[PDB]
Design a protein around this ligand. Structure first.
Ligand SMILES: [Ca+2]
Ligand SMILES: [Ca+2]
Ligand SMILES: [Cl-]
Length: 191
């Protein structure tokens, strides 16, 4: 990457004070998925685990994120993909403490997973960044705009990026790391 060394230095400093938590969606994030690239690149970043990944169940994802937060010593940034991003949203909306910010990458339309009754179209109590594709099967761009506006999130148009997964080339996704660095630095307690 053109900006790799500067990305890594900046993110290494952010990590001295904030903890990144990776939240995958359905089936987990495979080895070539950006969340997995990022985990290998930043081995101190955290990642949720659970026994079953193949059934969308909001409460299981929420329970996994809660488990993860219970042992965090610093404020967390939740970095979600698809169903994982919905879970990140729901946990913040239900009033979970210890969250500095959330990054929602290709959040799914709640109806696709029959959780339209659990995700509110209302502001998230913390700073939020949302990345939306124009050819994501689970979320139209105009609906991404609707949700971002409702959630009071910044909306980052990544073009035709499919579902923002390995099959689409994400992948190392240095641009996501760059944006994360920008966003997270303003959340650091002592900068
Ligand atoms: Ca973990
Ligand atoms: Ca229904
Ligand atoms: Cl998903």
């Amino acid at each position: 990457g053109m900006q790799t060394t500067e990305i890594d230095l900046r993110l290494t400093e952010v990590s001295q004070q904030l903890t990144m938590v990776l939240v995958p969606g359905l089936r987990d994030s495979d080895d070539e998925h950006w969340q997995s690239h990022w985990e290998r690149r930043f081995p101190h970043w955290q990642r949720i685990r659970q026994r079953e990944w193949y059934q969308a169940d909001l409460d299981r994802w929420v329970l996994a994120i809660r488990r993860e937060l219970s042992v965090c010593t610093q404020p967390v940034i939740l970095i979600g993909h698809s169903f994982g991003a919905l879970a990140a949203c729901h946990v913040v909306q239900q009033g979970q403490e210890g969250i500095a910010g959330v990054m929602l990458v290709a959040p799914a339309e709640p109806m696709r997973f029959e959780i339209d009754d659990r995700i509110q179209a209302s502001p998230l109590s913390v700073p939020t960044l949302t990345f939306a594709s124009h050819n994501d099967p689970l979320m139209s761009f105009t609906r991404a705009q609707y949700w971002a506006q409702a959630w009071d999130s910044e909306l980052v148009d990544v073009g035709e990026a499919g579902h923002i997964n390995a099959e689409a080339g994400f992948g190392p996704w240095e641009y996501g790391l760059k944006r994360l660095a920008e966003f997270s630095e303003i959340l650091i307690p002592n900068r």
